[model samples]
Target: EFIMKTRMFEEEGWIRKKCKVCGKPFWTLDPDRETCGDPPCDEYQFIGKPGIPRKYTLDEMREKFLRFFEKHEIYPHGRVKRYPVLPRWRDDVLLVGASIMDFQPWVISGEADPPANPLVISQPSIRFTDIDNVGITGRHFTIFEMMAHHAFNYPGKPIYWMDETVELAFEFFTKELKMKPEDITFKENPWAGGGNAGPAFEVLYRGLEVATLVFMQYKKAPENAPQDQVVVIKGEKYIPMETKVVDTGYGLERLVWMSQGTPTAYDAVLGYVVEPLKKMAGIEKIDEKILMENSRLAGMFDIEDLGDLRYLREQVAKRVGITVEELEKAIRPYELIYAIADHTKALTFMLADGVVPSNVKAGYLARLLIRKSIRHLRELGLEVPLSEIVALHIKELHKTFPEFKEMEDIILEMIELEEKKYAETLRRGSDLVRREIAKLKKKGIKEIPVEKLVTFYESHGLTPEIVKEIAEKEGVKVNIPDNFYSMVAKEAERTLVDFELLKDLPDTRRLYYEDPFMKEFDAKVLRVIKDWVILDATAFYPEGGGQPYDTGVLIVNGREVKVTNVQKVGKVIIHKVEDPGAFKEGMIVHGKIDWKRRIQHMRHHTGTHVLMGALVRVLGRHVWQAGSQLTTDWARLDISHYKRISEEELKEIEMLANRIVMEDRKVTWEWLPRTTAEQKYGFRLYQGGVVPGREIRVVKIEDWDVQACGGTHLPSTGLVGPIKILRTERIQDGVERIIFACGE
Candidate 1:
């Protein structure tokens, strides 16, 4: 299913042949070539040899790639600016892993049009899957730019397809970069990720796989697949899509690496900051020959085998004519230096994006990277502060990406704050583990339970090694599974709550958005599947945009049916009923909203807007809403802040919010095109997260706050009453949750 024998390949005399080493089929100009052109079939042939047209700097390479495509008219404005690494618009993945993620589900699933068709982009992507392999492998990086030209192909609108995509890559490598065609091969490596599957070609040059060209045309089969349809093919599964997309990813760093023929990618891209870092750490010298030799062999080992990285070390030692112990002693310092350069740079970009070091979600991810950098720096016996190191990294990177300079002070401050936090975490984590171990020993338990183990692993920053040390001291035994961290990572993935089978439902007309004061409405029942009822139009608001669902009663023949829950899937709203006596389809019923409850939610929701406006007023432009929940009595608003809000700041914020409430600012909202709304209001409008559809409901509190919210709100702030800030707590390192209530 992933193989495609198109006319273009046949015309170019590109024959598909299996690699003798791996048996994976690939298209190559040379018919007799047996190897796949990837390690261990081939070694680093490009090292010390100019592989591209000429040696280009990082910024030069980026501009050249973008301009090449622009000259081809692929993207008129060159490419769109890189999206935030935090990925606020997306639900899956903490970071932007690819350029294509910018359009997944929306543009790919036909739900929305691409911002620019046939657009080229250089998106800064972050991935921790190869975190351990980052400095070890010459090709691996925690963060890198994925440059690509995307062509979204609808059934009626065909911009370009697989042929044009392949030709563009071929021309760029052979014609533009002056690389030999025979040396450049397309190895068949199919890809499936982020809800889309496609046939892809692994673009290999000499021994290194530089990029992937994927013709994404198959969407993952939904969980709601038809019972009778035969969708599964072999172990593969997807629904055939009418639309085809050109989803390609070219590593900007890899291009630079190949162009310069640097022994390792670190030297080509990350090398600029290494000398300064080494000087700061007071490093004298490292064996360049051994570092290069290890990087060459590192390509042979995968992350799975990196734990026994000792085995790879042994092999490289033999090849380099030295003992394993001697090689280990020699390369250890350089390894620390390499990891420092890569991680410090990665952390710089993340911190610049306003990621606060915390113990949950993306904040935790940032904290992990920072902690690792500190550990390595300390292992090197360097007393150089983390903030000083981060400052140096910023000084180097700010040349190309100026955004880093803007957030320099914040980045430095966060690093200092987080280093202190890590020290505290270690102190706390050791004590917590020891106390738990003591408790277990008193019960005559000789083993640490997996339940308790997993909790500490997630809640605290205790690794298996740390827990084992503490547990063994208390006369308790512990054996951590090899896949412990993998399991811990998977635990965070929450399955989407699927409703019971309910077929053929139309979009529900939402009366709540039409007018929040609406108390009652008449609607015809479109379908009643068991206890779940779908209405043609509803005053009952579904749970969305960090707001709770609306609940009321449907009166049929003067009989009341209680609405227990409300949920929106697709374009329709599903109202869960306690009992539906003779509540059949096509029956007209009088729906009376639980007005008192909804009005409370309205006041709370509007009050949240007032609080957000005031919080920003007090906290500066760095503030962004992170999470929120609204209810009848009170509301909770989590905002991105460098530190926890102080008592004085809280009082001032509450005072301002209440002042606005007394001012009775006119609360109004209107539907506008998503483009226009975004242009006028900026991405700040998506504070509650991604608002779906072309036209977004833009809510404004009369020159105060503007958000693309779908939640119910009051007419004026006066109805919200005096808001009392109940409490402020640090939800995470950079996030603070403020709980507030209206009225007396």
Candidate 2:
């Protein structure tokens, strides 16, 4: 049986009991408590009355957390800076949803060492899963700082585990914040994500979950193993991992709300931004009691579905002695104000981190936030431009992060361009929605289907509410589902990749990385199945990261076998050859790569780096690589831009790239720890996308560029010879594809 009890509970004489109301197990100081101190089980007890000794602003709370951890007597933690909200180093997700993601698969899996044994950071994170609940739920935020302290434990040299972790969190609440011990409850819960699962404790105080302590010790099991030994977590099988990790998250906004005893989190954290916007919109509300009661009732349950939300509103209206319609009318302006404040903050972080507004990937999510904020402002009858509101957020956030001051111009420009584009889309989408409604009426269909609503939203950038208004004007009935936005949000979630077959194989030694110019090497065939040959080591490059595979020949028993392509499955490399009859397991073979082809690839790959640096100089810091490809003849780089490149700008970019080559900057690469590399180079190291492993291959051109790359590159920029801009194409809105040649 799995044990949930820790030594801290035993030492303090705390009892482990199951709550009668929610049937969830919890550890508490009071022996006779009947319910867990969380929503739907117990009402909020700290709304009107503060839970802590004194109120703390957002900056004060964040600094307090960092200082407490750094000065701990027994297990002090090193303080680290917050990572960017846009997760450019990772290909698995579009945004950083948690602080622990900074050291995921690499540090947590024992493949790489962490930056510090135990560290504390306040990470700005973004999540869109509950977009519709942003303002209505009273606590939901599109952007919030996840304050966390993490520890990585190797098998033999352990730092700490469950016992010390619980004690630290306990002391932080009771000693540092001066909260009553009886007010805290550690509710048992399980968390699984990013291919790992663990048992966790949801630390609650006066009906709000302020933190989660996760013990990450299990990983997804390999296929065809004994099923009886696997533990099922959220319907997926997992086995024990070699390295266990202690991951904890404390919501900075929730903590601030509890400290200040505000009616809502927005009131506590975004009051300054909200008050200014309210005046700008000519809103003068005078019903504090009603808004306070509504937030308290809304805080009791997690509002995911609109049907439940409607019922909750009705119940609140009855309790407040007002009609449901009257309550909505009184609260609608505040809701729009709250949503606008939250969305604009999120947009500021995204655009400031080099995200472009487009129709795919991270860019699409940015577009969604921008469009939503614009719609909310229009509903509030706010005549101010979207860019001005975003400017206010930037001005406020600049107090904490002065870098926002530097990015003000580009951030405002992007938002202004997006506003223009959104208006154009509305004009085009009106005609499109009306035509669809006409087609449905001609077909004898009176009600607009949910499928049509989704299509219009996805294809034409139209929201369901916009579609409903247009359809109702056309005399067609439109029944918007309660979970309409949730349905749309599901399309943006990331999918998992499976690597079962190669789970048991050893990692292939990459000779190409050791010496990119190595044309010949001797290796032993580890496994042979049909046309695929697994080697213990080789000099061939695999097809990945927009670079093509290396083709060569394998000499076996005086017979020449042509290698067609190379690929990496998990950590093992497999080669597809022309003949399978010439290879056998345990046979010695000589491998030779095609030097002519490999040389061209190296030139183009390095030239891509040189050109990117030039683009940034000519354009702005907002320019980033959206996609890239390299070949023998030419290379193409897709870049994020608000406008097309002019003929003069193209010539300038070309001349700058060639100038870098002429300077003969020394090109160098090294395998550095992930954290060290990120701190040194910043997130720009992921120009090739986030590379997996403990130590990433960092290719750097002295004073020119540096990125986490696995492709072969030259040792000096002079080797690239010359770069010529063939042409440029507008691949999509906010993105430009530049085609160029590197050599004569």
Candidate 3:
């Protein structure tokens, strides 16, 4: 029962008092208690109409956060201006959230130390938590930011604590927003995430939870009951240290939500981008009153949340006093325009944070959006590459978040790749459409298969309705599923591990990082139970993230254990060894790193640097890489910005890149302390990645470009000679794709 769930809180005795107004059981010290401590428990209508007009528009919500945090000493002055893109802090997660989202994943479980010191970052956070709520709730966002300020709890000076946190935030809102002091309430709540949980407060503004400031200073209840509790930290008890941590977040977008009080937060914030795109989408005359009623009603028609496009179309038509079909025709352009706009902005953030548009990880989100944009464009009779729109947003937004400026060329290249992908999709879609049309012709059927329509949306990123529009334009009738999107996870899953099914594999100790091409070394065959042998030490790297692992043989006592594949499990590497039982525990075996393969990978890896360097030269330092992958066979890099790359531009970059390779600059690696390395190399050193150790191993390609990477590399630029940028396309708006082949 909810009563027993509060048994822990009951220890405080203030948890059981019932509210006088609604008589609901609760936990708090309230003179005029509520039915429940959440929104909808009390109507926000009391706040009534929107407040005083301000000079800051809804679109400038980002700036609002800057100014607000500044007032609270929580902004540019409270801490440091984090390099727009996080560098040397390879925490796996992209786009830092509040300073806490950056550290939570790494530290809560004790995997790695927090990425930054005296942490503060306005991370380009992107999430789909409110995807379903987007355009519907008006108050929700698919992408927003969490302006974070963090401290990892060092020696005294009261590092970070709960009560002071709440006081600072309360002062910010009350003093800055000029809100009613008595109206503000700090409702008690339990904060839990990433294995940390403790008492916290949900700071409510006018009825809605503007932000939840959590004081997660404790670990989850122990696996066993507290009756047998015993633990240690730094050779002392764990409970004390656990009780001294602080984590909180103030949603930048949500602040704008309370400040503007618009029909929806989207209207106030994203409306800058959305409103213009809506006009372009051909839905200029739709009324918000009608859309408000319809988008919400559509949710009720089915819990599955269907009829969005259709319902919105009807509402627009009713408002404009036009037929539904006419409204649909008019609005088609707007949907494409906005979808393209949103997708590109999202790309700019992801790219700058180094999200490569691969077929895995968060990269697929870019791909999914790319396909969606293409589908919309196909329906709109537009030939403009989607990258153009994305570039424009980048140019406009970079003025505000300057980081986007450094990534312009990368953005251009990425968009160019997406554009190329568009052409490929058109060709592929054409072939598939033609094949289907022929099949229909053979069967004397007038309609395209609904399953095929779903397949196009699923595989090629086309929707049934979009297929119909395009097919009709090309002289064919397309069929559609009764309710399609429900069949697919709006966001599909990514295949995490390359060899997820292999079992009983041993973790490989990569001596390669210590020696990229150590042909021979002593490695231990840790386990060889049954037909499998797991190595305790190895020079063979594993295939992960984007690169393929090293494959070689381990010889012990004049016997050989062939390793075919390698992978990573946390800090350990799993190597698939053959003749499992032939190996024995603690056997010191001779190991060799495939020199030829290592060298080839090095060439491509170094070539990736030369390519970006050329991009910086050609596109200016504004061009920052969004995402990238390097391999012996080839390499692909995604950059951030609003423009698309072109065939001529790709050729120029490839040509110029090889020219740098011809210069034969020295390629070297240096390991330095985290703080010192960041200072010397600057944030740019993380182009390859923030390889997760404190003592960073920096791979510098001379004057070309420096990066913090653990992967193999060439000894000289000349060794990465003759690079060929095979193709470039727009992977998404603000995301350009550059795939190339390099050789020695």
Candidate 4:
């Protein structure tokens, strides 16, 4: 069935009311409400007897949902263009999540323009690291995509709000999933985000909130504005300041859950995957029933969870009446098969998103996953090529996500890379595992630093277990950590936690992109407790766009709040306070531009794109875009090619680059779809970085080249004047690094 928001409060004259909670205002009920409404974002109790429904097949459920959405106005939006996995389009995330995540960062912050207000895109998104939870968590999902509908605020705005959003969701459950209408509930909650918040309605099906209908509007308001109850966001309600979000996230996997009514969500989404392994291994004799029951009670347990696999092995042995060693031997291969299935599915999304098996950032995350799966297989002594399993899964899933076609080569490369790493590191990895086994052999020294193990893999391409095995053979002591990869998750969660603590008076608005050449603007100081003073707006570019940040002071009520370095803690940028809190909320102030740093960054950032484009032209087609860091002092471009950059080639690239700067050609940047740019310009357009969004800003170097990019750049190649490629080196295998300076 169709899932979309199509309701607004225009008839009742609840015509968009600007809210006092979040600053942007919207039309809605309750003028006295400072916030709009408040998720599983309020807790609810189930009053009716809960009964599990009969299971449905994937095809059956797919048809039902399509009809559900078609019956409502939620028509098929088609598979959204995949945002480049390389993550260049955003400064925040490494890859896209929901379609909204694509725009939220740049839009609210005013970095780029949306194609249209209130448009819809059924975007496919990638989120790995949830490998273990996917089929087990009853409601957990890994790469099941979002059928998203976005409204950018159309004139006379055709986009629907909470009432319609809730109603459509209810219809999907009732008419589509065939759940009872009376069984659904909409809890009261307010929603906020994308620089706005509003009242929201949380829709529930069978005690679980499948979705929330939010009326997004309003900017966050000052605490002193005690009278105005509500605020509107570009005509949308900004803040109910509660959990109620405009529109909602109905878990698609949960839809499969209700359709199948299985013991877990995994049974529905991953049933096809698990069935083959069960048949091949003949698990009926292994007492899998008991193993599953135990697994359910204690979630998130993988083979890596134990100090040894002993606890897991014993659990199997006890249930099946087999010796512990025998159980380990039998379960070992089956477990590897299962892990490979899950891991391959995840990497499919990664490769389709343009992730390669590399050793940094998001790519490294992809590498860790593939390597972990390989370790399990080698440990089990299985002979299957992991790539075959990936191909099988992809063959089935390509109908859902066609982008996987483009990713087949990378997927093969990754699998091949893992195999090579396993071969090379296995002997070393085996020794490491043996060393650990010896420690366990001696009085059980159970835990080792998870970070150390992670870093070991980071630095050495081998895991603790591989090392443990080698140590065990040598009769040396080796102990392994409990919850190995989960340690990585905990680290990721810490970052998410740090993001939650950022509550500044207001998120700073960007003026640089509006007119990159515009040099000055006025501002108002929002707060000043001691030395730090928050501004209403500032012309001082805080230092991003991959170039070193601009340094400037805030003239708050004519008293400058010394702004030092600026860092994005999360969605908010934290200005390193040179002075303590000193500015008060709502005070008018002036913002001066740091022309030196801005111009420097502009020249360097643009120069970076130029060098990247030129290097690709020189290196030939095999060179894919890799990672890079840029600054005014020097900008570097990292491209993907197996071979090293020759000094002569580097000099030639630099000469070609400077020739363009000297020619004085115009340079322009604007938004375009990532897919379109890739299609038009070919993959070579991404020589700088992957742009992860529906649309990206393309930086044009005359007619010579085009690439999707963000960051300050010179208006003309003439402004760059000249560039010098100071150095070139192989930073890593498959990555060639070149550093340069412009305007000399």
lDDT string for model 3 (521-583, tens) is: 876665543444456666776775356787777776788777777766665566667866666
Candidate 1, residue 94: the lDDT equals 72
Clashing pairs in 1: none
Q: Which scores higher on TM-score, 3 or 4? A: 3
Models, CA RMSD each:
4.5, 3.4, 8.5, 12.0
- Name the weakest run of 10 consecutive residues (lDDT summed) in model 2: 493-502
**Candidate 3 vs. true structure, TM-score:** 0.65
Q: How accurate is candidate 1 locally (lDDT)?
A: 0.79
Per-residue lDDT of candidate 4, residues 259-295 (tens digit): 5545455556666666665564454545444334333
- Worst lDDT 10-window in candidate 1: 226-235
| CA-lDDT, candidates in order | 0.79, 0.85, 0.59, 0.57
Q: By the TM-score metric, which is better: model 1 or model 3?
A: 1
Q: Which candidate order results from sorting by TM-score in descending order?
A: 2, 1, 3, 4
List runs of model 3 lying over 4 Å from the truth. Answer: 1-30, 46-48, 51-99, 107-118, 154-158, 188-200, 217-245, 274-344, 351-363, 370-392, 403-456, 467-491, 496-664, 673-690, 709-744
Per-residue CA lDDT of model 2 for 80-180, tens digit only, reads 88878877766777788898887776778776677778999999988887777777867889899999889998899899889998999999999989989
- TM-scores for all candidates: the values are 0.85, 0.91, 0.65, 0.59
lDDT of 1 by residue, 387-447 (tens): 8878887888787788899788778888898888778888988897787788768877778
Weakest 10 consecutive residues, lDDT, candidate 4?
A: 38-47
Model 4 misses residue 639 by how many Å? 3.0
* Top of the candidates by TM-score: 2
Order of quality (lDDT): 2, 1, 3, 4
